[PDB]
């Protein structure tokens, strides 16, 4: 400490300097899936409802068979497909002991509560984007894997990549069904794909041959009329999803039976104060439609 | 008209289909707009990555941005329809009239 | 300086024996940083004769 | 980052370089849409032919 160099007067040893108890904070993700989707309150464990199917056609007369003379066809004899909403649960805990706060500084208590809620917030946010099926629900990026929503290919997997405006048009051509009239769709793009989008040279280029005045004040996040949402929760460059687009009009609702409760026990414990927190919020779709992910495979 | 493109398979729709359809339609059939253009759901999508004059940027539009393409296609309104069958030798447009 | 994430996990669905299913989390292990400072100095001279 | 220009001459520095260059830093980066840019005195007189 006062060493290196200590010459020639007082040398002493090391710890001979004032320390500062202040903290600072680097990067964060900005939270865009955990606060964008309608809460459904419910008092049970599973919620059920029926929904109609479509056509339901009626046949025309054979231009001779007008009388009785039966034969006219009929519509859909069995109907009213049920839909079930399951609910999934999670928990966390953190336990402190007296022996690690007495020889310290008397400041670790409020910081722990801030950290566990952020760790919970990171964990739910990744699960909603990326998730499997067993124990924890399936996530948004692999939501578009079961309905055949996918495409091959968009950009070129790190050999002259570009993410040009015709990508999103081809992506909506691939989704197609059933509402082209802009029902407030939500689109989320990768960190790198967001950065690559400003090399273009397409639609919103560096000249006024393409875009009208829309940047304002210089290369801002505006695509095809809509703003664009960016996230750092995409997996590192490979054959995965860099762009996800979902319809938001009836769907992407989250059922929940409580809000966040955070509590503490220490009786009849020995020593420790132990914090507990529990949750029950998950993601589902009513209808298997309106979801696409690019992908971005290889070229 | 037979044939502009080839069923997605290397070149898509182009804004000069509508001029050719209007040219062959009914000779004396004009009198400004007052003509109805029905467009397939498919055909509406590939005319939206343009690259043509009726764009959503600035190339030759009425300043559309806001919304996601507008009914200005040679002065005709755009009517969507999703009821169209196999994409091979089929019709994707209908130009029809309602003045008589 | 306070540390990075921070991951929780989800129950085995059936379990209800407490059995908290939480993994465990990294209580209060963090990292320090430090600042070190260099000295810049000059000296120059002049003679009585000029 | 490698490469744009190769010793000026016949390949000069144009304004697209700062698009690919910031692919790991700021705008968005950590959370802040602000940066400060410093350029060479001679390179400043290259940025006139674009």
UniProtKB/Swiss-Prot annotation, chain C:
Where it sits in the cell: the answer is: Virion
State the source organism's domain of life. Answer: Viruses
Q: What does this protein do?
A: Major capsid protein that self-associates to form 120 hexamers and 11 pentamers, building the T=13 icosahedral capsid which about 860 Angstroms in diameter. Responsible for its self-assembly into a procapsid. The phage does not need to encode a separate scaffolfing protein because its capsid protein contains the delta domain that carries that function. The capsid gains its final stability through the reorganization of the subunits that takes place upon expansion. DNA encapsidation through the portal triggers capsid expansion and the binding of the decoration protein to the capsid exterior.
Assembly and partners?
Interacts with the decoration protein; each hexon binds a single copy of the decoration protein. Interacts with the portal protein.
What's the protein name?
A: Major capsid protein
Please tell me the species this chain comes from: Escherichia phage T5 (Enterobacteria phage T5)
Q: Source organism lineage?
A: Viruses, Duplodnaviria, Heunggongvirae, Uroviricota, Caudoviricetes
Span of the full-length protein shown? 210 to 259 of 458
């Amino acid at each position: 400490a006062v060493n290196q160099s200590s010459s020639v007067e007082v040398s002493s040893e090391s710890y001979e300097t004032i320390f500062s108890q202040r903290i600072i904070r680097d990067l964060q993700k900005e939270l865009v899936v955990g606060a964008l989707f309608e809460e459904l309150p419910m008092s049970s464990k599973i919620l059920t409802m029926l929904v109609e199917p479509d056509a339901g056609k009626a046949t025309w007369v054979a231009a001779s068979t007008y009388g009785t003379d039966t034969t006219t066809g009929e519509e859909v004899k069995g109907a009213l497909k049920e839909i079930h909403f399951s609910t999934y649960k999670l928990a966390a805990k953190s336990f402190i002991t007296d022996e690690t706060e007495e020889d310290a500084i008397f400041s670790l208590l409020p910081l722990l509560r801030k950290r566990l809620i952020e760790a919970h917030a990171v964990s739910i946010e990744e699960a909603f984007m990326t998730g499997d099926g067993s124990g924890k629900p399936k996530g948004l990026l692999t939501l578009a894997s079961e309905d055949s929503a996918k495409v091959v290919t968009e950009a070129k997997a790190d050999g002259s990549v570009l993410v040009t405006a015709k990508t999103i048009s081809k992506l909506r051509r691939k989704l197609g069904r059933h509402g082209l009239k802009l029902s407030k769709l939500v689109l989320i793009v990768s960190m790198d794909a967001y950065y690559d989008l400003l090399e273009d040279e397409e639609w919103q280029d560096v000249a006024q041959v393409g875009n009208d005045s829309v940047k304002l004040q210089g290369q801002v996040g505006r695509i095809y009329g809509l703003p664009v949402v960016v996230s750092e929760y995409f997996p590192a460059k490979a054959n995965s999803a860099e762009f996800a687009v979902i319809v938001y009009k009836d769907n992407f609702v989250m059922p929940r039976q409580r809000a966040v409760t955070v509590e503490r026990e220490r009786q009849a414990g020995k020593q420790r104060d132990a914090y507990y927190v529990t949750q029950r919020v998950n993601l589902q779709r009513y209808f298997a439609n309106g979801v696409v992910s690019g992908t971005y495979a290889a070229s």
